[PDB]
Design a protein around this ligand. Structure first.
Ligand SMILES: *[C@@H]1O[C@H](CO)[C@@H](O[C@@H]2O[C@H](CO)[C@@H](O[C@@H]3O[C@H](CO)[C@@H](O)[C@H](O)[C@@H]3O)[C@H](O)[C@H]2NC(C)=O)[C@H](O)[C@H]1NC(C)=O
Ligand code: NAG
Length: 593
């Protein structure tokens, strides 16, 4: 007879227990009386007098379980009651057991498609309803099925067709047949990610793609500014929702991780939703967590030398006593190369990995660290090995070494090595033959008009004796210069044997004489060495033939001069150790007129 009224509710039709709700009856015709019906029975009646208005209110303060049911509104003017508004289901939650909700495969879905969601609840004979948080409340009703293989009771829903214009947030409910108006508490907020058809977002991790465990990091998803909410997801499944993003400058979805654990590694992809619709997924960014398996640290060696010339073969050796599956090399803190299988060696009780690089390009100069990991956890790595640095020389002027503070040293003296060159190199490097450590320093500008590098070594010990080389390069240049001809550092006071010295001619010779001098030892000595106080030159090393049981060596001097004040001491050495000298000898001062 009259225009049918309209029924509105605030908030939405599904309300939790002990929460205030308000019905509104809407019309603009007349207001003689309003009637609220519950399940076809007169529940309440409101009269608009004793202040006249246009729309009626019904407050159900603190809703309980009995308030759930179908509600309708009617109104009367004069003496004519006008039909019924379309019914409205008021549902209340509680009393029951909370279900769980899972994506059977993944929430990723192509636009205009369907996804399968498994809801799980422990009630035997229950009907299940899957709903979405949207304007048009879409519902799905299914029965409980139990797979004999899985030995579990649960239902499945095919949601769709997933349109890219609407955001999809799914929630599951379970209810008894004979009590339909009372549902279970809502399950987890399961949101779907739609592979849209718009512009791709750029993804980054500013601390890096390889992070040691227990540390913090950030992930940025930037892109089209049509977006409102940003998401992150993994193939090893995660879902993270960021609705309010950093506005300056522009929509940049920031995600923060305070400490990396097992679940935080894997392949990440940013998804995006906006007013125009969903977007194509981002490129796959692999996040790696190291630090786990913090007991058996791997060890890294290099063959043949940590410094190689351009155009050679270089073998890196990553080994460990522990049964890892694969090893991976990292230049700087970034990736390089690829993974290789471990190899159980019978003799050395080791698990080995042999990384081949040939030829050696100047780009290989860097800081390599090898990690170990397993096949079933490709992103969970071991502890970084003690790093191995690599330098490559070849083409430029040789930077000769000053090698000051003498050529032979007794323990313990403070040794320094200065490295100079004609070309104004901005950076110098030092390395000992047969070693694994390399040293680098920035050159200072001297008064002469070129660059020199100051190198401070520690206490001269048994190990400091050997062969040393230096290299030079510019600030921008990645190619290093060929080394200088080798410096031989010698250590005395190491062998128990002690020689002595003599000369043949007179002490006060004229400046044109010849002077042969001799030092021998009754014990076995292979080579002998002559040393002068402050000898800037390399000392001469001579072979030993045994006259009697004593081992000796003559040092001849031809065309002597007064510039040579004299030769003072003699040392010994053997073929067993070419650079480790014996103790000092009796000094002998010479003079030349
Ligand atoms: C790097 O360290 C070296 C270490 O020798 C510095 O070399 C300096 O060289 C000059 C001469 O080339 C030395 O001067 C000397 O001073 C004494 C008196 O102190 C004098 O009797 C000598 O005739 C000579 O003039 C100087 O002592 C020496 N050491 C220092 C600390 O200056 C070099 O300057 C350092 N810096 C660079 C950029 O290489
Ligand atoms: C060249 O670059 C290195 C590395 O940043 C720096 O140590 C050095 O001060 C720079 N310039 C000079 C003149 O050494």
């Amino acid at each position: 007879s009259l225009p049918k009224p309209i029924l509105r509710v605030q908030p939405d039709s599904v309300v939790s227990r002990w929460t205030k709700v308000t019905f509104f009856c809407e019309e603009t015709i007349g207001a003689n009386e309003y009637r609220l019906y519950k399940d076809g029975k007169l529940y309440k009646t409101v009269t608009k007098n004793k202040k006249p208005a246009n729309k009626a209110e019904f407050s159900l303060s603190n809703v309980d379980l009995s308030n759930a049911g179908q509600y309708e509104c009617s109104y009367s003017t004069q003496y004519k009651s006008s039909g019924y508004s379309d019914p409205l289901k008021l549902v209340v939650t509680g009393h029951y057991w909370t279900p769980s909700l899972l994506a059977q495969a993944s929430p990723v879905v192509t636009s205009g498609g369907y996804v399968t969601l498994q809801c799980e609840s422990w009630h035997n004979d229950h009907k299940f309803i899957l709903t979405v948080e949207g304007p048009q409340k879409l519902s799905w009703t299914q029965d409980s099925q139990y797979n004999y293989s899985t030995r579990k009771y649960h239902a499945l829903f095919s949601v769709g067709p997933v349109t890219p214009n609407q955001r999809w947030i799914c929630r599951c409910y379970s209810y008894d047949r004979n009590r339909p108006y009372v549902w279970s508490p809502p399950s987890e907020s399961v949101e779907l990610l739609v592979s849209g058809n718009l512009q791709k977002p750029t993804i980054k991790a500013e601390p890096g793609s390889v992070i040691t465990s227990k540390r913090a990091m950030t992930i940025w998803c930037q892109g089209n500014l049509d977006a409102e909410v940003y998401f992150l997801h993994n193939e090893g499944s995660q879902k993270t929702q960021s609705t309010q993003t950093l506005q300056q400058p522009g929509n940049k979805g920031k995600f923060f991780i305070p400490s990396m654990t097992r679940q935080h590694a894997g392949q990440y992809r940013c998804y995006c939703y906006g007013s125009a619709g969903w977007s194509q997924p981002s490129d796959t960014l692999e996040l790696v967590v190291t630090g786990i398996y913090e007991h058996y640290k791997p060890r890294l060696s290099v063959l043949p030398s940590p410094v190689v010339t351009a155009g050679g073969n270089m073998t890196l050796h990553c080994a460990s006593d522990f049964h890892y599956d694969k090893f991976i090399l990292t230049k700087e803190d970034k990736k390089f190369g690829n993974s290789l299988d471990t190899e159980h060696i019978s003799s050395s009780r080791q698990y080995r990995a042999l990384f081949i690089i040939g030829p050696t390009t100047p780009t290989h100069t860097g800081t390599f660290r090898c990690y170990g990991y397993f096949k079933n956890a490709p992103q969970l790595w071991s502890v970084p090995s003690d790093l191995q640095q690599i330098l490559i020389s070849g083409l430029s002027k040789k930077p000769s070494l000053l090698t000051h503070q003498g050529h032979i040293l007794d323990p313990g003296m403070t040794l320094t090595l200065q490295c100079y060159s004609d070309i104004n190199y901005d950076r110098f490097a030092l390395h000992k033959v047969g070693g694994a450590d390399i040293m680098q320093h920035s050159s200072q500008q001297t008064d002469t008009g070129f660059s020199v590098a100051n190198f401070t070594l520690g206490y001269v010990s048994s190990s400091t004796g050997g062969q040393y080389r230096c290299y030079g390069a510019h600030n921008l240049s990645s190619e290093w210069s060929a080394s200088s001809e080798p410096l031989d550092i010698l250590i005395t006071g190491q062998l128990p044997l002690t020689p002595s010295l003599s000369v043949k001619p007179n002490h006060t010779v004229h400046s044109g004489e010849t002077v042969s001098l001799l030092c021998w030892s009754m014990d076995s000595v292979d080579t002998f060495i002559l040393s002068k106080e402050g000898s800037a030159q390399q000392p001469l090393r001579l072979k030993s033939k045994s006259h009697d049981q004593q081992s000796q060596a003559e040092f001849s001097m031809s065309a002597v001069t007064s510039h040579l004040s004299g030769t003072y001491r003699c040392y010994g050495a053997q073929n067993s150790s070419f650079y480790l000298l014996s103790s000092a000898s009796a000094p002998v001062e010479l003079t030349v007129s």
